[PDB]
RNA sequence: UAAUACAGGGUUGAACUGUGGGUUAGUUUCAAUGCCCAAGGCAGAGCACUGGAUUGGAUACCCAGGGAACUGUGCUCCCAUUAAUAAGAAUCA
């Protein structure tokens, strides 16, 4: 029974790994096929400055 | 800050890579104007200076003219010296 359990677990793990690989490969292929998107939103002049802890201790 | 030429950086993705970093002097690339030097030299405007006024009075503010300075792989970094109150990690959806 232990051996049969191990064999069934192996088969299930093989199937799961193959499915995961196919999904990931498809996603990355689609990413590659897509043309680079150009960020067209607002800029970061507000974020250029930072407000950290003032004085010593920072 | 149109096009073109030569170079970055940023953003997005794929691949690669596999603790390969954070900070930094016996370090040095860059860096407003002025000054020194060199260039040119009369588009504009404009220190000193001249003369036309106001003022007890003005060496100024106002007006007219003006040969100092205004474009440099040079000399070069003084400063109320440049995106701030140094840089990095953690805490947040």
The coordinates were experimentally obtained by cryo-EM
In whole angstroms, B24 C1' to A41 CA is: 37
Tell me how far apart the alpha carbons of residues A40 and A27 are, in angstroms, rounded to a whole number. Answer: 24
Return the residue matching tokens 């607002």.
A42
Strand B within 7 A of A38 CB: yes
* CA-only gyration radius of chain A, Å: 25
Assigned token pair, A8: 């069934």
Return the residue matching tokens 């002049």.
A45
Tell me how far apart the alpha carbons of residues A3 and A9 are, in angstroms, rounded to a whole number. Answer: 10
Return the residue matching tokens 């088969």.
A11
Return the residue matching tokens 């498809």.
A26
Tell me how far apart the alpha carbons of residues A50 and A26 are, in angstroms, rounded to a whole number. Answer: 40
């Amino acid at each position: 029974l232990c051996e049969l359990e191990q064999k069934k677990r192996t088969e299930r793990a093989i199937q799961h790994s193959q499915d995961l690989w196919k999904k990931r490969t498809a996603a990355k292929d689609a990413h590659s096929e897509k043309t680079p998107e150009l960020y067209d939103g607002p800029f970061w002049l507000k974020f250029w400055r930072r407000k950290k802890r003032p004085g010593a201790r920072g």
